[PDB]
Amino acid sequence: YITRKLTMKPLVMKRVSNQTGKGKIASFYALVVVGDKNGMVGLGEGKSREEMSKAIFKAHWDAVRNLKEIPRYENRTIYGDIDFRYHGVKLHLRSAKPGFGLRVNHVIFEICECAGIKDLSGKVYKSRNDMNIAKGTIEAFTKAQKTLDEVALGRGKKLVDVRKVYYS
Amino acid sequence: NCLKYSTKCSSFHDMDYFITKFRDDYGITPNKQNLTTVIQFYSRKEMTKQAWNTFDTMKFLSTKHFPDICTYNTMLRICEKERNFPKALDLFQEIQDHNIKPTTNTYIMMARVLASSSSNAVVSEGKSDSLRLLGWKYLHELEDKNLYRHKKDDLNLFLAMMALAAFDGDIELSRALYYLFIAKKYKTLCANWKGNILVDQDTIWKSTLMPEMLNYLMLAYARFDPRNLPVLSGYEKGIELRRKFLREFDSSMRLKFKLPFLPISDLNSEAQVLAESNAIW
Amino acid sequence: MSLVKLANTCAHLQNCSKVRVALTSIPYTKLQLQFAYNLYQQGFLSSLQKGSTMGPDKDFVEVTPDNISTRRLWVGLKYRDNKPVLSSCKLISKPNSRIHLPMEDMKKLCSGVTIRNIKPLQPGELILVRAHNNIMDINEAISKKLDGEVLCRVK
Amino acid sequence: LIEAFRKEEARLLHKHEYLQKRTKELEKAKELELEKLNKEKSSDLTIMTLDKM
């Protein structure tokens, strides 16, 4: 299941130094996202001294471990707007009409492509770090999103009642 | 007592007369029990909105007026009648939240609400099997603890089970439950009948035949799909319950009074279903 | 009718939800009472009770100017599946900038357009509008063709 | 010019009668709504209720 269905895309690939007394030691950080495009996604991180390949390797395993189900509306978009603050990134994301593109920041684009979020429009305010953007994106996707079924049951209402009325 | 009899005769004018009389001439306003009786009145007249308004007022006025498990059971009955399972579940959560203690009737009424809600995909919101399953789980939670029983609850329990059996199209369970109920009713009446059995056989059978059981059995027949699999088949507690009831029905048939059930545990064809439908009708 | 009192109530419900308190209290005014009733009818609040500052009322008490100062409305909060039903509560119409919308712009708001920099209605959301001293859901306000002031947003 | 003046008077009269008529039919909608309120409160047991409070 895991290899054939999950798709891996590197999001961050960089060199971070830890200057020790003898000299500058340089290691490789990699941040990746694995998603089946069908409502399951996860993020992974890896750190390797000798070659980035090992960093991406451990990142792939870590992403596989943290693979989690993601709420989705019609299997194409978020249930409602998500306004989320994560360690200095402000993500404002909006659900969209069918056929709407992924008109978002690129990091969010790969995350949505991996997780099967077809439709979204969003803006990133305050800091624009890709690392924090990705972490906050997944967190706001899973914590900050509530399914209409769950909302209705928590309110003890039928889906017909909670569903919005059509106006024109 | 006035409101009790007025409900039993469903006289709206008598309700108005008694309530207005007491308030005007006696300074007496309904307490929690009288307001619960008023809710039962509104339920009798199928006036759900007024019943919910009264329930809200019982919560609002004071803690003495605050609903208890009896009023909550009545409200669960209203939820059954409206086939409103999310509200029934939310109410059950409220009884747990307010520390009110459930009773046998609470579990039975929840099971009936879920059984009725699971009738169609439209009313069940596409969770019909899940709702029947949850009703069965509530019946199991009943079976765990003694709670407080009521002389009538036993009957309702059977009906509740049959409801979950009837809406799932489980012919064999419906047949088993129908046979066991009719047999126990007939034997209990005949054992406790003052007159001779033979002369009063008409009255005995009229007492024995409860139309609700017949209607639920025929609903079990109508929803027959050969490819269907019962919800109670999957679970271990469920399969054990099914096995126990089917074994009891089989043994009872193997061992007076007779019913025209065909000599088979299950009906596997439409033709046999039609034959038994005509037989019981 | 203070938007200040209503804002204080909104923040109080938010805080009460975040620390997971089952029962709390709010001022006993008709704006607060109508607000609590509309939240309760929509399933956000478990129950409403009359009471005093000390607690809910044991027996029924008439409301008079003698006891009005200490009267309170005790709202019970719902927590389902380890989450708060009344997750968040906001005021759209601040005391500074008050938003009185005609019916057409309420329809636009319910239909996804942003009017007067108000983020439009969301699926699981509730918006309350006061028209002629009666609080009501925005959908009902549109249904009755009532011009009114949009007050708040509970999600 | 005679035809123009007469037709302009005619359109004004007909239009005003039209608007008045529309309002008079809308009166029917109001009164039937009030009637529907009667049946709403016909089934009332006189106990004070929270919605009424």
Give residue limits of the domains in chain C. 1-86, 87-155
Resolution reading in Å: 3.8
Question: In whole angstroms, how far apart are CA C80 and each of A69, A136, C46?
Answer: 20, 25, 11
How many Å lie between the alpha carbon of C56 and the closest alpha carbon of chain B?
7
Please answer whether residues A104 and A136 qualify as being in contact, where contact means their C-beta atoms are separated by less than 8 angstroms: no
Three state DSSP letters for C15-75? HHHHCCCCEEEEECCHHHHHHHHHHHHCCCEEEEEEEECCCECCCCCCCCCCCHHHEEEEE
Are residues C76 and C46 in contact, defined by beta-carbon separation less than 8 angstroms?
A: yes
A160 in helix, strand or coil? helix
User: In the structure encoding, which two tokens stand for residue B17, read together?
Assistant: 């007369």
Q: How far apart are CA B116 and CA B81, in angstroms?
A: 8
CB contacts, 8 Å: B89 with chain A: 153, 156
Q: How many CB atoms lie within 10 A of CB A162?
A: 20
Burial class, A66, CB count within 10 angstroms (exposed 0-12 / middle 13-18 / buried 19+): middle
The two beta strands, A102-103 and A120-126, are parallel
C124 touches chain A (CB under 8 A): yes
CB contact at 8 A, D45 and B44: no
Residue A27, classed as helix, strand or coil, is strand
Enumerate neighbours of D (3 or more CB pairs within 8 A).
B, C
- Distance set, CA A137 to CA A74, A96, C149 (Å): 19, 17, 35
Q: Is some CB atom of chain B closer than 8 A to the CB atom of C12?
A: no
Cα gap D51→A40, rounded to integer Å: 46
| Cross-chain CB nearest to C111 (options A80, A81, A168) | A168
How far apart, in whole angstroms, are the C-alpha atoms of residue B92 and residue B103?
A: 11
Cα(B101)–Cα(A74) distance, rounded to whole angstroms? 40
Of the candidates A71, A83, A84, A79, which has an alpha carbon nearest to the alpha carbon of residue A164? A79
Using an 8 Å Cβ cutoff, are C129 and C149 in contact? yes
- Contact (CB<8Å) C110/A157: no
Chains A and D touch (3+ CB pairs under 8 A): no
Q: If you search the block for the tokens 């007025």, which residue do you land on? A: B6
The full set of domain ranges for chain A reads 3-69, 70-146
**Which residue from D45, D49, D51 is facing B16, i.e. has the nearest CB?**
D45
| Residue type, position C130, single letter | R
Distance CA B204, CA B211 (A): 14
Residue of A80, A51, A73 whose CA lies nearest to A144: A80
